[PDB]
Amino acid sequence: DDKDPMSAIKPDMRIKLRMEGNVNGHHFVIDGDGTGKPYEGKQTMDLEVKEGGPLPFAFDILTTAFNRVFVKYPDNIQDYFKQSFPKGYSWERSLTFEDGGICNARNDITMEGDTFYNKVRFYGTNFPANGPVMQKKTLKWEPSTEKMYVRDGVLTGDIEMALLLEGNAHYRCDFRTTYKAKEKGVKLPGAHFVDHAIEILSHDKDYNKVKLYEHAVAHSG
């Protein structure tokens, strides 16, 4: 062990992002600019809708597609994401909501110097016209625990999410993310959990500009 552990992943990195896709036929393009500390499991991002604004659907369904490199991994758990760089990795995610709405998100994450670049694509469909997503009745994603494990040789993360709605109601969704490193020799980690909390710090009236924050910590049992 004579190599620099932070030779690729610096304690303070920048994040550049561009999201492209549509939800129920409404195309949009959102840019992302923020920083974060990977070893502390924190990241902040200033978002701006460049096309398709104002979004006719809830902005909360997109926040989780706006990088597990910002996870505070203990020394007894293999960090599959921090060992994915400088080359990077990518993930594919499916979001299955309780009223039939289904989304497919993916992000190709590369590293150029001190900046994380993200090529995000978000495609949602089957959302009911009177549902809380199209009617914009959501408030926040509840903090929740993602479970990491190896499924058929690929690092998989399932979690049961929940969106707080207006009127003391909840709107649940089931996530399934597959994380693949571009170097196919990166050692897969063991089964562990990732407690995370995502929230919108500030936003304008039409959600054209959003300041997003996320905090995540990894642990086992």
Q: How far apart are CA 152 and CA 19, in angstroms?
A: 29
CA 108 to chain centre: 12
Q: Which of these, 26, 98, 104, 10, lies nearest to 58 by C-alpha position?
A: 26
CA distance 161 to 219: 19
Task: Give yes or no for a contact between 178 and 68, defined as CB atoms under 8 angstroms apart.
Answer: no
Q: In the numeric block, which tokens belong to residue 143?
A: 């903090």
CA nearest to 90, candidates 190, 7, 217, 184: 184
Residue 131 CB contacts under 8 Å (≥ 6 apart), including other chains: 99, 101
Q: Which string of DSSP letters, residue by residue, matches 110-143?
A: EEETTEEEEEEEEEEE---TTSTTTTT-EEEEPP
Look-up of token digits 């990166």: 186
- E strands, the chain, where? 13-23, 26-37, 42-51, 89-97, 102-112, 115-125, 138-141, 144-151, 154-165, 169-181, 192-203, 209-219
Residue 72 phi/psi, 5-degree rounding, is -80, 95
Greatest Cα-to-Cα distance within the chain, rounded to the nearest angstrom:
59
Tokens 């991994």 found at: 73
Please state, as a whole number, how many other Cβ atoms lie within 10 Å of the Cβ of residue 58: 23
Amino acid at 32: G
Fold of domain 1-221: Green Fluorescent Protein (2.40.155)
Structural contact between residues 69 and 43, judged by C-beta atoms closer than 8 angstroms: no
Residues near 46 by beta carbon (within 8 Å), at least 6 away in sequence: 32, 33, 34, 209, 210, 211, 212
- Report the distance separating Cα 64 and Cα 84, nearest Å: 20
In the numeric block, which tokens belong to residue 89? 């990795």
Give resolution, Å, one decimal.
2.4
- What is the C-alpha separation between 124 and 94, in angstroms, rounded? 10
d(CA 9, CA 91) in angstroms, rounded, equals 18
Name the DSSP class of 77. Answer: S
What is the spatial distance between Cα 130 and Cα 159, in angstroms, rounded to a whole number?
A: 26
Whether omega for the bond prior to residue 128 falls within 30 degrees of 0, making it cis, is no
Contact 28, 176 (CB under 8 A): no
